[PDB]
Amino acid sequence: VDPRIQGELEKLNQSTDDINRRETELEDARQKFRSVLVEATVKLDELVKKIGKAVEDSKPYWEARRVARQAQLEAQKATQDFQRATEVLRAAKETISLAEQRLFDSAWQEMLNHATQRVAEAEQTKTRSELVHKETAARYNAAMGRMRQLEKKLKRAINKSKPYFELKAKYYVQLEQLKKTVDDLQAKLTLAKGEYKMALKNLEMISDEIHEA
């Protein structure tokens, strides 16, 4: 049973070598992340040190823009849902129209009865959908108005702050992806450790096997 434990321990040796490789890889990754983030720090600081008033005055505009976008998505959803509701009502009424024109009669009766049982909830959903639609559109356009009057008084600031924020954005998504890489890589490393450990457990199992033999 010697070649068995031999091959086993060789395989786990390859495994722990792999572990070492992934460890060094991870360390290198994080060390790469750090320099990038501090670069982002100093560039952000220097660009703020360029013109601070423009940026600080620009922020409310971006705030209003975000709010307006949220209201946009909400209003869009409300509109779509209302459309679906309208379609549902259309079909539900078309059914009863045909059924009434007909006046296998039992099947027709059951069908029109189920339909005319569903049209009530249909109408309720219609009302809900349309009122929600109106509200959403209202808040929507209100936010658009405030954003407009904000854009009227911030033409000089936001243009200056635009490159700062786009740079900040690029560095943000970059460091984000980097951190992602670090995370999943470390996870895979842990899994590898699990594998190596499992090979060791096999070693213990065989060690238990032989002395019993």
Residue numbers in the entry: 41 to 143, 151 to 260
The authors write:
Because computational secondary structure prediction assigned the N- and C-terminal regions as mostly disordered regions, we selected the central helical region for crystallography. We found that the R260A/R261A/R262A triple mutation reduced the degradation and obtained diffraction-quality crystals. This construct of SH3BP5 (41–266; R260A/R261A/R262A) is hereafter referred to as SH3BP5-RA. In addition, the M167A mutation was introduced to improve the solubility of the selenomethionine (SeMet)-labeled SH3BP5-RA (SeMet SH3BP5-RA/M167A), which was used for phase determination by the single-wavelength anomalous diffraction method. Finally, we determined the crystal structures of SeMet SH3BP5-RA/M167A in two different crystal forms (I41 and P41) and native SH3BP5-RA at 3.35, 3.6, and 3.8 Å resolutions, respectively. The asymmetric units of the I41 and P41 crystals contain one and two SH3BP5 molecules, respectively. Therefore, we obtained five different apo-SH3BP5 structures in total (i.e., one from I41 SeMet SH3BP5-RA/M167A, two from P41 SeMet SH3BP5-RA/M167A, and two from P41 native SH3BP5-RA). Although these five apo-SH3BP5 structures exhibit a similar V-shaped conformation, the superposition of these five apo-SH3BP5 structures using α1 as the reference shows some flexibility of the conformation. The hinge region of the V shape contains staggered hydrophobic interactions so as to maintain the V shape.
